[PDB]
């Protein structure tokens, strides 16, 4: 019976190139729910990181309303392949080095005209990092999200009201070289030469384990500096003692530094 | 109503393979605004760098003029998918190792017939580098831009009058191994065996932080050369002293150099 309802909707005068109607003439409200699957390849050198996520968008297209009140028809109808539905031309501004597969897509049409869009994407995103504090620093990488063609008069994004950003079970553990401390959903809507475009930015905060770098780098040299001191507690007459101590400690440090 | 205007234009005899008309019979003026998103992977070895940008081209096609004076119609109309508009066959001469996605495109048709073209591209561009001065050098990489098929009689590019080159908020910081000192928009129109083709070249200047390389490479060895001198202030009789000093310093330098 679902194929009979999808038939009734698109047999009409629906144009998937045409922006959905608004009662006020205002923009189309787009609710956004995001789900971070995995994060990897945090490239300090090439200023980029590989993140994999699941995006969920939600808007109201009154044209697609079949049941309206419904309550005698299925709540939503899964859209089958072959029917075009207008969607927000979403793109990632900071996306880089990206080739797109295709399908892992899901489109639901609720009776009131509410559409749910779900998609899986692998993205490489540029992340400017600052290494003044090494190795005890902290970086903040982001995923920007906006429309390309439609301005602020036609479309405006809003983070979903509850849990806008969700993370896979062991994401904090999953990362190879950093530890994820914080997440943050903010807005990054800005004004460019072409116009004012609504934009969402999700952000993760990575800091490194001080423990590792303490044991691997700091503690060894602390022992070497201490060793360089015990030549002071030897008398002046023992030339072979203090010469060997001094020159070896320096050779060791050069190796340690190497 | 925008779909009704786009209909009226292409319902006529518009050929997207035909160069737009000129009142003088002259070339088609193409204004170019460029925006450098991100720069990364500055490969010294393979002589190339990955740069990501947003190109804006602008020309006048009197055929597409719908409102002319307008002032009673929308200033511009966004081009929907399915309509072909003649565009400058722009290509990057120095582009290398490049695969193209697809869409991140934007086409506006102003009432007077002015067209705006916006596009996002990731490019790998060959950059000949000279390392006579290491590490205190400076490199200049460029992005060349020209038409392939059309000669100087049909099309001529001109940098936009104001801020032809624009850079993302933290580009100077974004770079991993170099520091961007200068930017420059010039012309590189040349004359080849096939003809005279108009060409735009944007240029960035990268030089390295002397500070780092000073502390990491130079200062350590300065200490080693000084150490080699203190064997002179020891008397001749102390054979174990000056032998150990001399041979260790040399071993250390070989390691340091390694």
């Amino acid at each position: 019976s679902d194929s009979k309802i999808l038939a009734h909707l698109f047999t009409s005068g629906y144009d998937f190139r045409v922006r959905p109607p608004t009662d006020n003439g205002g923009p189309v409200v787009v609710s956004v729910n995001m789900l971070l699957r995995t994060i990897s390849k945090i490239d300090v050198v090439n200023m980029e990181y590989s993140a994999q996520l699941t995006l969920r968008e939600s808007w109201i297209d009154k044209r697609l309303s079949y049941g309206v009140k419904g309550d005698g028809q299925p709540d939503f109808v899964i859209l089958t392949v072959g029917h075009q539905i207008w969607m927000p031309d979403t793109f990632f501004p900071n996306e880089k080095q990206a080739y797109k597969h295709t399908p892992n897509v899901l489109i639901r049409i609720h009776n009131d005209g509410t559409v749910l869009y779900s998609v899986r994407i692998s993205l490489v995103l540029s992340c400017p990092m600052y290494l003044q504090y090494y190795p005890m620093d902290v970086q903040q990488c982001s995923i920007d999200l906006a429309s390309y063609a439609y301005t602020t008069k036609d479309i405006e994004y809003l983070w979903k009201e509850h849990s806008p950003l969700q993370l896979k079970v062991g994401l904090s553990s999953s990362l190879p070289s950093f530890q994820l401390t914080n997440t943050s959903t903010t807005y990054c809507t800005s004004v460019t030469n072409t116009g004012i475009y609504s934009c969402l930015r999700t952000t993760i905060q990575l800091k490194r384990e001080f423990s590792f770098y303490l044991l691997q780098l700091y503690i060894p040299s602390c022992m070497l500096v201490i060793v360089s001191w015990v030549s002071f507690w030897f008398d002046r007459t023992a030339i072979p003692a203090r010469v060997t101590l001094g020159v070896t400690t320096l050779l060791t440090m050069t190796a340690q530094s190497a | 109503s925008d779909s009704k205007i786009l209909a009226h234009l292409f319902t006529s005899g518009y050929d997207f393979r035909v160069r737009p008309p000129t009142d003088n019979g002259g070339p088609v003026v193409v204004s170019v605004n460029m925006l450098l998103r991100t720069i990364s992977k500055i490969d010294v070895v393979n002589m190339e760098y990955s740069a990501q940008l947003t190109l804006r081209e602008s020309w006048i096609d009197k055929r597409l003029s719908y409102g002319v004076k307008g002032d009673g119609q929308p200033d511009f109309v966004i081009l929907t998918v399915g309509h072909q508009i003649w565009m400058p066959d722009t290509f990057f001469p120095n582009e290398k190792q490049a695969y193209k996605h697809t869409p991140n495109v934007l086409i506006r048709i102003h009432n007077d017939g002015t067209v705006l073209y916006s596009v996002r591209i990731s490019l790998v561009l060959s950059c000949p580098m000279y390392l006579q001065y290491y590490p205190m050098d400076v490199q200049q990489c460029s992005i060349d831009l020209a038409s392939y098929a059309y000669t100087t009689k049909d099309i001529e590019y001109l940098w936009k009058e104001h801020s032809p080159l624009q850079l993302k908020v933290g580009l100077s910081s974004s770079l991993p191994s170099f520091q961007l000192t200068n930017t420059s928009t010039t012309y590189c129109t040349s004359v080849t065996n096939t003809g005279i083709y108009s060409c735009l070249r944007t240029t960035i200047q990268l030089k390295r932080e002397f500070s780092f390389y000073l502390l990491q490479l130079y200062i350590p060895s300065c200490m080693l050369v000084i150490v080699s001198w203190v064997s002179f202030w020891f008397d001749r009789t102390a054979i174990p002293a000056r032998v150990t000093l001399g041979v260790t310093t040399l071993l250390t330098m070989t390691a340091q150099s390694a």
Partner: antibody
Amino acid sequence: EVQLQQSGPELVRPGASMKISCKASGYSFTGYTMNWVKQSHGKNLEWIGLINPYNGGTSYNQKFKGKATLTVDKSSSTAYMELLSLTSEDSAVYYCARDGDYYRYGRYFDYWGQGTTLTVSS
Amino acid sequence: QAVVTQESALTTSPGETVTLTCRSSTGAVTTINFANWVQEKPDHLFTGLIGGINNRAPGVPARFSGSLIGDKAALTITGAQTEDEAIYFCALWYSNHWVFGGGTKLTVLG
């Protein structure tokens, strides 16, 4: 603290045109976008348009298309506003208002200038 | 296009709670209107208060607070002060531009 010192009041005749200055101080100028508001005697507070010192882009109200022209000089930390074809109507007090978010349009008003009284009569 | 309607003028006592409304003519004031509130001191002095999604201008008292009571924008001052006596303007975002209102003349009786 921050400051937005505008230009001194001007007296000009209909048909002419002039430019109102607005110097910024106390913050990274290229960071926050700038607004411009018209306070006329007859009408309520009207909104002219806005400008991004870093982008250089501008977006005007539909009413003020051609009436106002926002510009900016990064070297002096100052936003400008030309007013062409001045008449008896354009006589008002003009304020410049900063946005509140750092390198992004947060769509909310921060600091205002003291304003500039423009008296245009013949 | 549309018009923003504020109260003519309101009166309150020091230490009390007062609420200014901001009605839209197109319909309900939603989150996409980014209701702003600007305070006009005498001699043409303006300063922003609440705006955007939850943003506040630096140096805005805690007694000031934004909300959406009913279907219009609300500026609530819990614990009014003598210096909070000024004219309060609210602005709404309609797709591409700001639309101010009439402005409410708040009086804190000294």
